[PDB]
Amino acid sequence: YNDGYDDDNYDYIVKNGEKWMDRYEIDSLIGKGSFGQVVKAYDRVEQEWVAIKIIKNKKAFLNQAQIEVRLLELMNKHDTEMKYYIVHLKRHFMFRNHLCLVFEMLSYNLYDLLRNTNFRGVSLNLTRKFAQQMCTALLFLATPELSIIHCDLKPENILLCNPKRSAIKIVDFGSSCQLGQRIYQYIQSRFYRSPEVLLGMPYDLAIDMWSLGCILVEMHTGEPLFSGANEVDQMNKIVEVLGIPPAHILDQAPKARKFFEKLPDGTWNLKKEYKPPGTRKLHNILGVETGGPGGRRAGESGHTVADYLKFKDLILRMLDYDPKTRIQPYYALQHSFFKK
C-alpha cells in the first residue's frame, strides 16, 4: 500500500522526526478522524508551528477535503473580524499521495476542557464568553454568500486558540455543506443532532444552533444534555426536557412514527424507563434557584438566579423544536444573557 507509507485504513503511517519537502518537521499525531489524521509540525520557512490534516489516500475523502478547502478559502476571502472564529487554512498540497491541509496551530478542544473540570463544568461567565464567540461564528456562516451549515458541532470540534485565553475557533468543515439541497441525511453527532434530522426532515443552518444550545448547557454542567444510546433514546431524552414536539412538525415528519403515535383526536404522544414528557425542566438541570448544577455555584459571583434565568431563556430559544422560529445568531447576540 503506497510504497509502505500507508496502513490498511489508507492513513499515512506518521513517523515522529520526519522532514517533508525540506520544509516541515513532523513532531507528533495530535488528532485522528474519518478524514485521516492531524499532526503538529514545524514550518522552517515561516518560522512557526502548524497543524497538518493528512487526508486518507482514498478518492471519497480526498473529494470531501477538496470541498473543505473550497469552503475554507471562501470564508478567508471575507473582510470581517468575524472570520477569526473559524480556523485559518494557510495552504494545501499533495504529499506521498495524501492531500495535506496546513492550518494555524490551535490548542485543546472544549471536551478536553470539561475533562480538566472532571466533568463538573466551567463557570457561567466562561460559558457566556464561549456562547458569544459561537453565535458570532454562526452569524458569519449564515452570511448569504457563505450559507455554510457546519453539521458536526460538538465540544471536540471547538478548540481554544491557546491554553491561557477564552478565545475559541471552529474546526473540521469536512461534514459541511452550503444551503441549497432541501434533502435529509443521517448527519450531526447523536448527542447534538436536531429534532428535524432525527425526524428525517430537510435541514438548514438552524441545526448548528440546536447543537450550540446542547453544547452550552454541557459546558456549564459538565455532562451532555441529551446523551442518547440511539435515535429513539435520543428523541425520548429530548422529550423529557422539552415535551412533545408541535403536531405541525410531526405531521410533516417522515420518521415521526418511529418515536410517536398519532391518537384518534389527531394529537401525538410517545410510542410504548423514561420520565414523562417535559418532566426534566432545564430550570432544575441548571439549578437556577438552587446554586447552579449540583448546587456547586451557591453564592459565587455571576451565578445569581436572574443570571440563570437569562441563560435558561437563551437555551430554550436555541432548543426550539421549530427550525423556522429557532433563534437566529444576531438575535441570540442581543439576548439579555450577554448584557453583562
Ligand X SMILES: COc1ccnc2[nH]cc(-c3ccnc(N)n3)c12
Please state the closest distance from residue 107 (CB atom) to ligand X, in A: 7
Is 53 a binder of ligand X (CB under 6 A)?
Answer: yes
E-strand ranges in the chain read: 19-20, 24-33, 36-43, 48-55, 89-95, 98-104, 148-149, 158-160, 168-170, 177-178, 260-262, 268-270
- How many chain residues interact with ligand X (CB under 6 A)? 13
The span from the CA of 185 to the CA of 217, in Å, is 26
Which residue carries 443521517 as its cell?
186
Q: Which stretch, 98-106, 140-148, 205-213, 222-230, contacts ligand X (CB under 6 A)?
A: 98-106
Question: Cα 204 from chain centroid?
Answer: 15
Helix (H) or strand (E) holding 138: helix 124-141
Is 61 a binder of ligand X (CB under 6 A)?
Answer: no
Site string for ligand X, 152-191 (x = CB under 6 A): -------x-----------xx-------------------
Measured from the CB atom, the residue of 91 and 275 that comes closer to ligand X is: 91
Instruction: Map the footprint of ligand X across residues 32-51, applying CB under 6 A.
Output: 38, 51
Backbone torsion region of residue 278, taken as left when φ is above 0, otherwise alpha when ψ lies between -120 and 50, otherwise beta: left
Nearest residue (beta carbon) to ligand X: 31
Is 113 a binder of ligand X (CB under 6 A)?
Answer: no
The span from the CA of 261 to the CA of 251, in Å, is 11
Q: Which stretch, 104-112, 115-123, 128-136, 277-285, contacts ligand X (CB under 6 A)?
A: 104-112
Is 105 a binder of ligand X (CB under 6 A)?
Answer: yes
Q: Give catalytic residue positions.
A: 152
Is 26 a binder of ligand X (CB under 6 A)?
Answer: no
Among 157, 20, 43, CA closest to 103: 43
Q: Which residues are annotated as a binding site for ATP?
A: 30-38, 53, 103-106
Is 103 a binder of ligand X (CB under 6 A)?
Answer: yes
Please state the closest distance from residue 206 (CB atom) to ligand X, in A: 23
Is 151 a binder of ligand X (CB under 6 A)?
Answer: no
The span from the CA of 246 to the CA of 328, in Å, is 20
Is 314 a binder of ligand X (CB under 6 A)?
Answer: no
Is 195 a binder of ligand X (CB under 6 A)?
Answer: no
| Amino acid present at 55 | I
Q: Are 61 and 9 in contact (CB under 8 A)?
A: no
Measured from the CB atom, the residue of 125 and 189 that comes closer to ligand X is: 189
Is 245 a binder of ligand X (CB under 6 A)?
Answer: no
The span from the CA of 147 to the CA of 158, in Å, is 19
Is 150 a binder of ligand X (CB under 6 A)?
Answer: no
Please state the closest distance from residue 62 (CB atom) to ligand X, in A: 15
Q: For residue 169, what are the β-bridge partners? A: 159
Is 92 a binder of ligand X (CB under 6 A)?
Answer: no
Residues ≥6 apart with Cβ < 8 Å to 153? 170, 188, 192, 208, 211, 212, 215
Please state the closest distance from residue 286 (CB atom) to ligand X, in A: 30
Q: Are 27 and 53 in contact (CB under 8 A)?
A: no
| Amino acid present at 225 | L
Residue ranges in contact with ligand X by CB under 6 A? 30-31, 38, 51, 53, 87, 103-106, 159, 171-172
